[PDB]
Amino acid sequence: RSPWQIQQAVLFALFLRELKTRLGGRWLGVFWVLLEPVAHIAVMTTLFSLAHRAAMPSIEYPVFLITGLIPFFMFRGLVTRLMEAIDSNRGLFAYRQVKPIDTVIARAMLEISLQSIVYLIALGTLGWLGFHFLPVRALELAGVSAVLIMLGASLGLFFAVVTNEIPQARAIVRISLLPLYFVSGVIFPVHTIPPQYLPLLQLNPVLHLIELSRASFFPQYRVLQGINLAYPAGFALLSLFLALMLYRLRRHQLA
Amino acid sequence: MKLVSRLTAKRLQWALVYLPMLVATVYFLVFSADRYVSESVITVRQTSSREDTCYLQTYIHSMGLLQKLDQQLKLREHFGTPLRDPLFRLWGGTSQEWFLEYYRSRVEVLMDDICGLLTVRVQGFEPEFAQALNRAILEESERFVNELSHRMALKSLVVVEPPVLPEIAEYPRRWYNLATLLVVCCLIYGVVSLVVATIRDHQD
Amino acid sequence: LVSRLTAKRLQWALVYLPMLVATVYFLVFSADRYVSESVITVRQTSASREDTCYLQTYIHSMGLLQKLDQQLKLREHFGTPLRDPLFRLWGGTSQEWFLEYYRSRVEVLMDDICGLLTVRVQGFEPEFAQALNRAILEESERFVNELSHRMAREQGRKLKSLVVVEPPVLPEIAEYPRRWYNLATLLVVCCLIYGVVSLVVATIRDHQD
Amino acid sequence: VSRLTAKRLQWALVYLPMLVATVYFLVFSADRYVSESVITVRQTSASREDTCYLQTYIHSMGLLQKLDQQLKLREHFGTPLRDPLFRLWGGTSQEWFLEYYRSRVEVLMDDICGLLTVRVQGFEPEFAQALNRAILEESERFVNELSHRMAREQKLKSLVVVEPPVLPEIAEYPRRWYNLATLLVVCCLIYGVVSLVV
Amino acid sequence: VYLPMLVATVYFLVFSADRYVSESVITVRQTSASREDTCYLQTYIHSMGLLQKLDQQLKLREHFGTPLRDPLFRLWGGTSQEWFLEYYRSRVEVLMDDICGLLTVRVQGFEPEFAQALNRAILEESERFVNELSHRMAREQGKLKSLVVVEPPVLPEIAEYPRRWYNLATLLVV
Amino acid sequence: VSRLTAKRLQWALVYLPMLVATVYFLVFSADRYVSESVITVRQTSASREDTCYLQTYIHSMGLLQKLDQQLKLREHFGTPLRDPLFRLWGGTSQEWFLEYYRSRVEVLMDDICGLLTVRVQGFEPEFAQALNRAILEESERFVNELSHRMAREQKLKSLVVVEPPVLPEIAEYPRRWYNLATLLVVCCLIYGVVSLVV
Amino acid sequence: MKLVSRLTAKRLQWALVYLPMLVATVYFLVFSADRYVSESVITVRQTSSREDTCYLQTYIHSMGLLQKLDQQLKLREHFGTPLRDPLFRLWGGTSQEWFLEYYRSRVEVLMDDICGLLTVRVQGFEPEFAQALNRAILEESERFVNELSHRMALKSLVVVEPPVLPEIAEYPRRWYNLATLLVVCCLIYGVVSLVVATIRDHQD
């Protein structure tokens, strides 16, 4: 057999295995995944409805929050679920076909599928209720989403390689994911921020990607200075190259 | 589990990719109709502010203005001419509400808060008709503002950009929409194929 | 096939061919684009933010482009470089594409804290760029004065003026075609892409046993 | 769990409500034409204060008395006899009449432009337009009288009509298909949640 | 590591040319809104017409090329107008204090007298520019804005910007 | 290795700096009396603008020239010959003279009350008080002349002295014991950090 | 090594608890002197602001006012009377700076932003002297404000609460300070004993 169908079979097998173990019981985890964003939308709308109403008179809060939140849930899942993909399946690396990166890409594919299904269902629900649901620039939105997905997968693979023997490193990055949820402009629009803190926030690629996705989604959405795609694209490419090189170096050290 | 076995892969990608792209390509390259767009940029200032422009924005998408324009330029007759297009053609015998929704879809009004300038983009099936409808909208808007000022008991409409005559259609964008639908269909087919494989494996 | 790819084939397909194409285009077929920069503001002579916004919208309009084309023949000028197909205005194009090209060539930036509008006009000759910038400034001032005049007439001498902090400067050398910087950054990106692709194909080939 | 079989329990929980709702919507339910108007208040030769005054006054009770005395609202709203849900039953309480009137007439306020949108539902296209015109006239008279009492304690403000009451052609309500699909989705979700507990 | 330090030391201690700095502190005030004219002036200092006026006033092109053993900070002969403008912008530093609304101008130069003269010319041209900018708007219908000097231009005695030891230590950090 | 014994490393690190610091402080270092004044600017019938003007002008160069011409600052500041660190060496550059003057004179601004505190150091209390008085007089003359230039283009503001320059009795500086204790603290910390690396 | 074993924790608790509390109790109940405090609450208004109140707050703790008050009421001689107290007594022959620091310690000035009322609390060794010093401070403050207004080319001092005559001393609080020192000494002894036990265990 060619060395490519082996990869396809292994990836399908690991995807099925991980989908089986992720959904506890008779698929109880899908309810949890569905109840995170509605709970988030409820609390944040109840808190800052008037705040967004005073922010800008062109966008309603649910759609702004959902297109700022679902991509961030995508990224957070691609970061968190990917470091544990190596140690949890450590016993599977004895069948002559399973390699450490196969489990990583299987977890990435499952996260992509689950969060994309959630995004489509939630967008359909928002359109059904009566809210805006059609992006004005779908191709640019797809490109930004692909860039964000690549950056998240690259960061997950890099962390899985680096912190293989250091669970405390996984713990501290899990801690620090939470401030990234507040400094990425997911909740509140970012143009209501004093300019002195603007350049310091220009170093966050996730903020750039969120702003560009919102621009490609909403019509006539104003984008402030330094929200170019070149910086997050280069960040994702460099991170992917570094992660692949590190995995190639520390390849035989995974049992 | 027998039904999904018949679904296999070939039939799945034929029913989820091939048919939608063929139908969309046929409609876009055969039956789709051109829609020329004329753009104007106006604002209202007192001869001697933002609220009056907002009233104009509300008034443009109203029913009285639509009745005036239908009496003047006969929009209902014009919008039914492209019989080749089934989607973006105003069918005969439609209701008042459907006519209002269609007119609101054709005419797009946009605002920015920083500059306070109101931009109107009017679609049509002829560049001359689109420009004429934009000019009529501007004239009726300035007349409404003046009549409101008169009946309140001295205002003028500033035209930063007068209505232009378009040269080619811009909105029935065929290749961009085809690429978007290709991406959407590919993602949908991948997700559906993965899910159907999972349920086929789980059922038996 | 995928399994028949070699390192030299990957290097030639990924790195070498775009390098040669970009070098040939930039060093031979690229046309110079001189830039003339001016800095202006509008204030009353006897609310300036609204007039700066009006000018910012009016500069990128179509009626101004019509006047500029009738006055200076922009369409004839921009089609002159035949050796550069990417940045030349091909003859017989559409009015919408002409407007898009004019909006791409002329850059308008605004400093809100200072309230200063800077206009950078590109051209294929320095004299034409300076003349275009001067014509744009004159037409902007005339438009502001005409707006004031028609407001006064609809109610029933120059009441508004445009103040130029920096007049249009005649450039000496081309600025915007940056051959070396673009070549260097594209080389870096290309090397990164080739490395990533080679690592991915090595990972795929690792499953041979 | 005695009758926990899929057939009978799925018959009882899901299909019977859908069938009764479908026959009610497509056979019994009447339709309500909507007339829309867009207004604001301007000072003749503080405006948001009178706009809020009008918003409270339209949903008040004395205006309901004036409208009932003028157009016989209680007589008109009880004419569809085959729609037990959306009809106004005779002999009902005054408070229930006020709740019904508040349900039929909707007032929306946009603060950024300071505009008031009044949507009046009816069982006849002419009646909704007439009621909307009466509401607008009574609102203008109300603000004029509010200024007049203040002047008398010893024509001041005018009502600006951006869009007059339109005459509907078809009924915007009750949106039978959308409601049926929403009910189907909700019932399917409820059935899935219930069948989870086994 | 040793070779870069050797070449840097032999360049700084032998080849590098001294650059004297003259400091001025100004602000423009209406003689009975001043932030507007201050920002206009701040833009005007780094403009091109001002550089042209300075060029046929003091001949900055000849002065900035007088060193010959310092090719790093030398205005080479036959350079473009844009590069000359960039060099002039690098040599003249303008700072703003918004909480006081004060403009600080630091002028570099290989001779202290020429640096002081350059700063004085910049100040007088700025005052004339403010006056003419008001006067054109004045007579478009057909002396009110004065620039006060909190600190007049000074005459430096020793070079300031060629900080050889500090730059050598900074290179030793890297 | 490299003679990492406790005695030799300590002799190289701790005692020698401390001993010399003490001998310099208690034998060689001279003392500097401080004169303090508290002022503000008021109109005789915008104030923060002239207060910032004065804050920049006190630390300027022309005022230093006037003060040197008046009180011979450069002659006085070089009189302690046994303090090589805090004395003003003869023949120094004008820029170093400006840095030394800026070090010896401290200007503090309190924005909430808009008050300027000037603390002038010297080697004689009378000289410090006289220098503070001269600085205050020159500041008042400077703001008066700044107001006068606009009139000459064709007495407006006064300086309010909340606290006049005081005449010190003892020297507030150099705080020998506090500096020695701080030096002991940092030296002990440095020794601990170094001895960590073994 | 030997030194840690020398404490035996009994001399340790004697030297960290018994001696400090004994010394403090002796000083507080034998040698401490009473310090009566007089309180006034004033503000400045125009007889026809906040900045003038801030100027008054700065002026009260100045050296010119201290010189005026020392010339008037002879504060330096009065503050040296309690020879029993070694701590809170102004020793003879002290410097000008020490006198200024002592006066700033005795007289406390507080200001609140919401109300803008300035409260002055003046300590002394006699209630009459404390009240007299507070009255003198108020009089000199109003005179300074009036002189500043006069020399600028019409202001008055609003005395909400005039200076009071205290009945008993309040600041040399003996029992509260003794309890605070007991808590501090207990915590310090516990920490030191634990640390010395750890190092005694670790050394061998």
Side-chain angles (χ1 to χ4, degrees):
Chain A
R1 227 146 81 212
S2 98
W4 169 235
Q5 316 114 340
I6 315 294
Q7 171 114 342
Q8 269 156 296
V10 166
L11 283 203
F12 268 103
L14 299 164
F15 168 70
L16 295 174
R17 190 216 79 78
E18 162 56 77
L19 178 51
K20 214 50 172 203
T21 166
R22 183 151 166 77
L23 301 196
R26 222 63 56 163
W27 328 291
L28 205 58
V30 296
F31 282 161
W32 260 61
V33 175
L34 270 194
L35 62 93
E36 321 286 320
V38 277
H40 278 92
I41 212 79
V43 48
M44 271 75 88
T45 49
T46 279
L47 261 279
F48 303 71
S49 41
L50 315 105
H52 183 187
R53 259 321 309 138
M56 52 199 335
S58 299
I59 298 101
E60 61 285 40
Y61 208 24
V63 61
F64 175 87
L65 225 66
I66 194 174
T67 88
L69 212 159
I70 305 292
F72 187 79
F73 269 10
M74 171 86 48
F75 176 72
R76 176 193 72 184
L78 274 187
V79 165
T80 279
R81 307 296 290 144
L82 263 306
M83 25 173 55
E84 324 312 12
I86 172 65
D87 73 336
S88 81
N89 320 50
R90 194 95 63 169
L92 287 166
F93 311 138
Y95 281 101
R96 211 201 311 264
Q97 273 83 319
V98 184
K99 309 306 201 302
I101 207 156
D102 298 317
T103 87
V104 162
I105 53 193
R107 298 255 272 205
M109 278 178 0
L110 170 151
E111 207 42 73
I112 291 320
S113 299
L114 272 184
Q115 286 300 323
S116 95
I117 278 175
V118 164
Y119 203 10
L120 295 174
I121 279 295
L123 220 64
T125 291
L126 248 68
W128 180 261
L129 182 139
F131 280 133
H132 186 218
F133 81 120
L134 166 80
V136 294
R137 265 301 201 261
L139 268 195
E140 280 82 301
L141 183 85
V144 167
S145 275
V147 160
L148 176 86
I149 282 168
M150 229 51 40
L151 162 66
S154 87
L155 265 203
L157 175 58
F158 168 80
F159 277 146
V161 165
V162 158
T163 88
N164 169 54
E165 52 285 30
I166 317 109
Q168 309 87 23
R170 325 197 189 154
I172 166 63
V173 316
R174 178 88 170 104
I175 294 308
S176 52
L177 275 195
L178 260 283
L180 196 55
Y181 164 100
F182 296 100
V183 306
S184 310
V186 162
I187 316 182
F188 204 88
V190 317
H191 34 298
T192 89
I193 288 304
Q196 51 264 48
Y197 317 107
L198 259 284
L200 185 83
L201 299 202
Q202 295 305 259
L203 291 106
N204 175 347
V206 194
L207 173 153
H208 291 224
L209 297 177
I210 287 286
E211 287 339 279
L212 287 194
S213 34
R214 293 236 199 78
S216 55
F217 196 95
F218 292 126
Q220 69 149 331
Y221 185 42
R222 202 267 330 271
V223 157
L224 48 96
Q225 270 296 301
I227 299 289
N228 44 17
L229 187 75
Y231 164 80
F235 208 101
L237 188 48
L238 188 81
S239 159
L240 187 70
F241 174 68
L242 261 53
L244 264 304
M245 210 68 243
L246 273 202
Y247 172 76
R248 204 70 185 162
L249 285 211
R250 311 195 180 180
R251 173 189 52 167
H252 286 197
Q253 308 192 352
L254 296 317
Chain B
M1 72 225 78
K2 53 214 161 303
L3 303 94
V4 297
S5 74
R6 281 127 47 182
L7 293 193
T8 176
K10 196 195 213 209
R11 283 179 90 174
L12 218 52
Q13 52 203 115
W14 200 274
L16 290 183
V17 166
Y18 253 77
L19 271 49
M21 309 285 327
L22 291 203
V23 152
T25 318
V26 161
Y27 171 73
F28 271 125
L29 269 304
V30 166
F31 300 117
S32 200
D34 292 330
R35 287 205 309 281
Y36 308 87
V37 165
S38 150
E39 179 139 336
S40 43
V41 172
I42 72 197
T43 201
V44 58
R45 303 277 90 184
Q46 181 112 61
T47 86
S48 317
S49 65
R50 214 61 71 71
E51 280 203 14
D52 312 359
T53 279
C54 295
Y55 301 185
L56 270 187
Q57 166 160 19
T58 280
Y59 173 65
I60 282 174
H61 272 172
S62 61
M63 181 85 228
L65 182 53
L66 175 59
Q67 285 196 278
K68 284 198 198 103
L69 297 178
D70 187 25
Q71 174 94 58
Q72 206 184 319
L73 303 139
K74 293 147 254 293
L75 324 176
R76 184 188 277 282
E77 174 264 352
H78 163 87
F79 281 129
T81 54
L83 325 164
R84 268 293 198 97
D85 212 348
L87 289 205
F88 309 99
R89 160 179 101 91
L90 191 71
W91 293 65
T94 36
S95 39
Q96 224 190 56
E97 278 67 44
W98 209 326
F99 191 26
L100 189 39
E101 192 52 52
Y102 193 82
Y103 157 80
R104 289 187 177 152
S105 284
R106 303 275 77 75
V107 176
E108 177 187 5
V109 201
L110 299 136
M111 197 96 153
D112 65 357
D113 41 333
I114 38 184
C115 305
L117 274 89
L118 189 92
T119 170
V120 193
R121 326 178 67 222
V122 158
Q123 304 196 35
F125 300 108
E126 283 177 28
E128 313 92 13
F129 189 82
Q131 201 216 355
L133 180 53
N134 209 347
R135 289 197 299 230
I137 283 181
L138 261 47
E139 195 156 19
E140 298 273 359
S141 293
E142 88 153 17
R143 196 124 33 81
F144 157 80
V145 154
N146 296 7
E147 179 77 17
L148 164 140
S149 174
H150 284 184
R151 194 41 51 211
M152 173 279 327
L154 292 117
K155 303 280 299 181
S156 277
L157 209 44
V158 152
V159 194
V160 156
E161 172 175 10
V164 307
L165 203 143
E167 181 138 349
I168 45 57
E170 78 154 67
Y171 255 105
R173 191 57 264 188
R174 294 138 171 105
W175 300 118
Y176 177 87
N177 287 357
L178 276 154
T180 291
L181 193 61
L182 179 134
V183 153
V184 155
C185 285
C186 209
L187 157 77
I188 275 279
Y189 154 79
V191 158
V192 160
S193 162
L194 260 203
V195 165
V196 85
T198 58
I199 178 64
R200 198 178 53 86
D201 162 86
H202 163 62
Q203 270 293 90
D204 39 26
Chain C
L1 213 74
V2 188
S3 170
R4 269 199 46 82
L5 300 186
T6 77
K8 59 170 272 204
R9 299 161 93 81
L10 255 72
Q11 290 197 244
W12 268 104
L14 284 153
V15 194
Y16 292 161
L17 265 177
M19 262 318 101
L20 301 203
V21 162
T23 324
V24 162
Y25 170 76
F26 273 124
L27 302 197
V28 164
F29 284 110
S30 186
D32 287 307
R33 267 183 292 122
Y34 312 93
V35 189
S36 87
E37 181 187 5
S38 94
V39 169
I40 46 177
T41 315
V42 47
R43 299 162 109 194
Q44 87 288 345
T45 175
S46 52
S48 278
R49 207 51 57 109
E50 96 188 343
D51 292 308
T52 55
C53 294
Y54 291 2
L55 278 191
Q56 194 170 2
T57 307
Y58 169 73
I59 278 165
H60 277 177
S61 70
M62 174 83 220
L64 179 53
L65 178 54
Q66 272 186 290
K67 303 177 140 286
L68 289 180
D69 191 4
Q70 219 283 325
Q71 188 195 326
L72 292 146
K73 320 295 178 44
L74 318 186
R75 195 186 263 284
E76 278 72 76
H77 169 92
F78 280 126
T80 43
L82 270 293
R83 310 282 106 198
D84 187 17
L86 287 206
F87 291 103
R88 77 176 286 255
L89 185 69
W90 294 64
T93 36
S94 44
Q95 179 208 84
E96 275 63 47
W97 172 247
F98 184 34
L99 181 48
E100 182 66 48
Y101 190 87
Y102 159 78
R103 281 171 182 173
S104 266
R105 296 277 79 76
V106 165
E107 164 177 54
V108 178
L109 298 165
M110 165 93 100
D111 221 342
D112 44 357
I113 39 167
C114 297
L116 257 53
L117 203 71
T118 180
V119 184
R120 319 195 66 227
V121 160
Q122 297 185 40
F124 294 117
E125 304 278 5
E127 310 94 31
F128 187 81
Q130 203 211 19
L132 188 52
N133 207 326
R134 291 228 213 82
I136 286 179
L137 263 48
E138 181 153 348
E139 285 300 324
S140 294
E141 179 200 38
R142 185 199 318 280
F143 171 75
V144 156
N145 284 172
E146 168 74 28
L147 257 180
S148 195
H149 283 157
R150 54 181 51 211
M151 235 181 277
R153 184 151 31 260
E154 292 326 294
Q155 173 147 297
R157 195 212 98 81
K158 167 185 283 199
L159 316 105
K160 288 296 300 314
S161 151
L162 170 94
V163 52
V164 52
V165 169
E166 173 182 356
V169 50
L170 203 142
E172 181 159 336
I173 48 75
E175 162 174 323
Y176 258 118
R178 316 225 268 157
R179 297 133 168 107
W180 297 114
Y181 174 110
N182 291 359
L183 274 155
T185 185
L186 161 57
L187 160 72
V188 170
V189 157
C190 210
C191 284
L192 283 195
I193 286 185
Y194 157 72
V196 168
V197 166
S198 46
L199 284 151
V200 154
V201 80
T203 289
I204 278 194
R205 209 150 297 160
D206 202 338
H207 292 50
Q208 63 96 2
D209 198 74
Chain D
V1 306
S2 174
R3 304 321 301 168
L4 213 53
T5 166
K7 178 188 190 74
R8 302 186 35 163
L9 171 153
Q10 174 293 310
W11 210 238
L13 186 50
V14 169
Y15 281 163
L16 319 177
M18 311 275 318
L19 271 293
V20 61
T22 325
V23 314
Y24 164 70
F25 264 134
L26 281 53
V27 183
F28 299 145
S29 80
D31 69 16
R32 310 186 293 280
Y33 307 85
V34 178
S35 155
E36 200 187 17
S37 163
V38 178
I39 43 181
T40 202
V41 185
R42 273 313 108 181
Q43 184 73 245
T44 324
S45 43
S47 42
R48 75 211 65 213
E49 311 176 0
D50 310 34
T51 307
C52 296
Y53 286 7
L54 278 196
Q55 166 151 29
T56 303
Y57 171 75
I58 292 162
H59 274 184
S60 82
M61 162 46 77
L63 182 49
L64 188 41
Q65 254 89 58
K66 297 196 219 276
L67 292 180
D68 206 325
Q69 194 184 320
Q70 225 202 11
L71 307 150
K72 334 282 181 173
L73 255 62
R74 213 197 253 276
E75 213 255 344
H76 165 94
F77 272 136
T79 62
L81 261 298
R82 290 199 294 118
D83 190 10
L85 203 147
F86 290 103
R87 81 173 260 246
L88 185 68
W89 294 70
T92 41
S93 46
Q94 151 202 294
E95 275 70 59
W96 173 248
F97 183 40
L98 180 60
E99 294 315 304
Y100 182 84
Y101 159 83
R102 276 166 196 202
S103 280
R104 299 278 79 73
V105 170
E106 160 153 67
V107 181
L108 302 147
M109 169 69 185
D110 163 281
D111 38 351
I112 49 195
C113 329
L115 287 161
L116 209 66
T117 310
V118 181
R119 320 192 70 209
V120 163
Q121 299 171 34
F123 295 118
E124 221 198 61
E126 311 76 340
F127 181 80
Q129 211 218 6
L131 179 48
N132 210 311
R133 296 164 137 153
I135 287 183
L136 262 50
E137 149 188 60
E138 286 306 316
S139 308
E140 185 172 31
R141 183 165 310 123
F142 163 75
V143 285
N144 279 155
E145 187 252 26
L146 222 57
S147 200
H148 265 192
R149 256 186 276 166
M150 248 174 92
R152 154 152 62 259
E153 159 269 351
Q154 290 36 50
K155 174 72 51 153
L156 290 102
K157 239 173 143 172
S158 66
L159 190 74
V160 158
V161 180
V162 172
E163 173 191 20
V166 315
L167 179 48
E169 182 147 349
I170 82 192
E172 200 157 305
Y173 288 133
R175 317 189 47 195
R176 303 161 160 86
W177 299 113
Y178 167 83
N179 292 314
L180 282 183
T182 281
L183 173 89
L184 176 58
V185 163
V186 154
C187 195
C188 272
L189 167 80
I190 275 163
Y191 183 70
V193 166
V194 164
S195 43
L196 160 74
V197 187
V198 158
Chain E
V1 180
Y2 37 84
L3 160 76
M5 271 305 178
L6 198 130
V7 298
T9 325
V10 303
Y11 160 72
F12 256 126
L13 268 84
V14 152
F15 290 140
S16 194
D18 277 325
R19 276 183 282 132
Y20 307 84
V21 197
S22 95
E23 181 133 314
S24 154
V25 168
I26 48 184
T27 175
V28 54
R29 278 254 302 147
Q30 183 34 270
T31 65
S32 313
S34 54
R35 334 288 302 205
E36 299 289 307
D37 322 78
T38 296
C39 94
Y40 297 5
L41 225 43
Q42 162 152 44
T43 279
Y44 177 68
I45 303 279
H46 278 168
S47 81
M48 184 89 231
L50 186 49
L51 177 56
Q52 284 195 294
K53 290 213 186 103
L54 271 62
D55 207 323
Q56 38 281 7
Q57 198 193 313
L58 292 150
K59 314 171 176 341
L60 326 176
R61 255 204 181 277
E62 171 135 338
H63 173 267
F64 288 146
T66 49
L68 258 300
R69 322 276 91 186
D70 195 346
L72 257 283
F73 304 108
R74 187 173 98 90
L75 185 75
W76 292 66
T79 51
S80 88
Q81 184 193 276
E82 279 69 45
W83 168 252
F84 176 50
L85 177 59
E86 174 64 36
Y87 188 84
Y88 158 82
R89 289 195 178 138
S90 165
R91 293 280 84 80
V92 169
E93 168 160 39
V94 173
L95 298 133
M96 181 85 178
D97 204 7
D98 309 289
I99 88 181
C100 328
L102 279 153
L103 203 77
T104 315
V105 191
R106 321 197 69 214
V107 167
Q108 296 192 35
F110 307 100
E111 206 202 335
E113 294 87 356
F114 189 85
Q116 205 211 1
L118 185 48
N119 208 333
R120 295 227 217 85
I122 277 173
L123 294 207
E124 65 162 11
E125 283 303 320
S126 307
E127 190 226 338
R128 207 142 48 216
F129 162 77
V130 162
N131 273 218
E132 168 78 11
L133 206 83
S134 198
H135 269 170
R136 54 188 41 162
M137 202 145 58
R139 95 210 75 71
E140 263 316 303
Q141 330 183 343
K143 181 102 165 74
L144 91 163
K145 265 197 295 312
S146 292
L147 171 142
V148 317
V149 278
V150 166
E151 176 172 4
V154 307
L155 209 155
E157 194 154 328
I158 60 130
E160 159 164 343
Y161 258 114
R163 319 175 43 178
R164 304 161 161 78
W165 305 112
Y166 172 77
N167 295 354
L168 280 192
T170 320
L171 192 44
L172 190 58
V173 170
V174 184
Chain F
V1 282
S2 179
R3 308 311 190 101
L4 253 199
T5 166
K7 168 190 293 290
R8 175 151 308 190
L9 163 54
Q10 264 155 22
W11 267 114
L13 204 144
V14 280
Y15 331 99
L16 290 179
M18 292 293 324
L19 263 313
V20 59
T22 302
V23 304
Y24 164 70
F25 264 133
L26 296 50
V27 184
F28 299 145
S29 79
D31 72 18
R32 310 186 293 281
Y33 307 85
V34 178
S35 155
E36 199 188 16
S37 162
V38 178
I39 42 181
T40 203
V41 188
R42 280 307 117 195
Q43 190 82 61
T44 45
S45 187
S47 45
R48 64 210 76 211
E49 311 176 0
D50 310 36
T51 296
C52 296
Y53 286 6
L54 280 186
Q55 166 151 30
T56 305
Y57 171 75
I58 292 162
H59 275 184
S60 81
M61 167 59 68
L63 181 49
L64 188 41
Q65 260 89 61
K66 297 195 219 276
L67 292 181
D68 206 327
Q69 194 184 320
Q70 226 200 8
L71 307 150
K72 334 282 181 173
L73 256 62
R74 214 197 252 277
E75 213 255 345
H76 167 95
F77 271 136
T79 56
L81 260 301
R82 300 215 173 284
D83 192 7
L85 202 143
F86 289 103
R87 81 174 259 247
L88 186 69
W89 294 70
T92 41
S93 47
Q94 151 202 293
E95 275 70 59
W96 173 248
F97 183 40
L98 180 59
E99 294 315 304
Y100 182 84
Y101 160 83
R102 276 166 196 202
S103 280
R104 299 279 82 74
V105 168
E106 287 110 6
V107 181
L108 301 127
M109 171 65 178
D110 161 279
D111 37 353
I112 48 193
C113 329
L115 286 164
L116 211 65
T117 310
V118 180
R119 321 192 69 212
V120 162
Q121 298 173 34
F123 295 117
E124 278 297 323
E126 316 93 7
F127 179 80
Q129 152 145 312
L131 179 49
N132 209 311
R133 297 167 139 161
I135 287 183
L136 262 50
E137 149 188 61
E138 286 306 315
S139 306
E140 185 172 32
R141 183 164 310 123
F142 163 75
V143 286
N144 278 153
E145 187 250 27
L146 222 59
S147 202
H148 263 182
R149 254 181 271 181
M150 277 166 246
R152 294 181 290 181
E153 169 258 340
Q154 294 331 333
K155 204 42 161 283
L156 288 104
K157 242 167 140 180
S158 66
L159 192 73
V160 157
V161 179
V162 173
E163 173 191 19
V166 315
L167 182 47
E169 183 147 349
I170 84 191
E172 201 157 304
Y173 288 132
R175 317 189 47 195
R176 304 161 159 87
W177 299 113
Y178 167 83
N179 293 312
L180 284 183
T182 294
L183 178 85
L184 179 54
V185 162
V186 47
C187 211
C188 275
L189 169 77
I190 274 166
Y191 193 69
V193 166
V194 163
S195 34
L196 159 75
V197 187
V198 157
Chain G
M1 70 285 278
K2 160 266 192 172
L3 54 103
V4 288
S5 62
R6 190 49 55 121
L7 293 316
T8 80
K10 174 183 178 181
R11 295 156 48 180
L12 184 79
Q13 63 213 130
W14 199 278
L16 301 173
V17 166
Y18 254 82
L19 262 155
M21 311 275 318
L22 255 51
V23 152
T25 318
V26 161
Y27 171 73
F28 270 125
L29 272 300
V30 166
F31 299 117
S32 199
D34 291 331
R35 288 205 308 281
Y36 308 88
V37 167
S38 151
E39 180 139 336
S40 44
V41 171
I42 76 197
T43 200
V44 59
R45 303 280 91 180
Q46 182 117 58
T47 166
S48 57
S49 53
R50 284 81 51 210
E51 43 99 10
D52 228 333
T53 316
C54 295
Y55 300 2
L56 271 188
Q57 166 158 18
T58 280
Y59 173 66
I60 283 173
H61 272 171
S62 61
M63 182 84 228
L65 182 53
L66 175 59
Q67 284 196 279
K68 284 198 197 103
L69 297 179
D70 187 25
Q71 173 97 51
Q72 205 185 319
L73 303 139
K74 292 147 254 293
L75 323 176
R76 184 189 277 282
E77 160 270 349
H78 163 87
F79 281 129
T81 54
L83 326 165
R84 268 293 198 97
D85 212 348
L87 289 205
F88 309 99
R89 158 178 101 91
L90 190 71
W91 292 65
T94 49
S95 40
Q96 223 190 55
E97 277 67 44
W98 209 326
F99 191 25
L100 189 39
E101 192 52 52
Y102 193 82
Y103 157 80
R104 289 188 177 152
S105 283
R106 303 275 77 74
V107 176
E108 178 186 4
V109 194
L110 300 135
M111 176 111 90
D112 64 356
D113 41 332
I114 321 91
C115 307
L117 274 89
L118 192 92
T119 171
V120 192
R121 326 178 66 221
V122 158
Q123 303 196 36
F125 300 108
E126 283 177 28
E128 313 92 12
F129 189 82
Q131 202 216 354
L133 180 53
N134 209 347
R135 289 197 299 230
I137 283 182
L138 261 47
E139 195 156 19
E140 298 273 359
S141 297
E142 89 154 9
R143 196 124 33 81
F144 157 80
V145 159
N146 296 7
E147 179 77 17
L148 164 140
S149 174
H150 284 184
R151 194 41 51 211
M152 173 279 328
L154 288 116
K155 302 282 299 181
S156 282
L157 212 43
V158 165
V159 193
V160 159
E161 172 176 10
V164 307
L165 203 143
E167 181 138 349
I168 41 60
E170 78 154 67
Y171 251 102
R173 192 56 262 186
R174 294 139 171 105
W175 298 116
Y176 177 87
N177 287 358
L178 276 154
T180 288
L181 183 73
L182 180 133
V183 153
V184 155
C185 286
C186 212
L187 157 77
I188 273 282
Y189 153 78
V191 159
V192 160
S193 161
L194 261 201
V195 165
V196 86
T198 57
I199 188 64
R200 211 180 42 82
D201 162 84
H202 164 61
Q203 269 294 91
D204 35 8

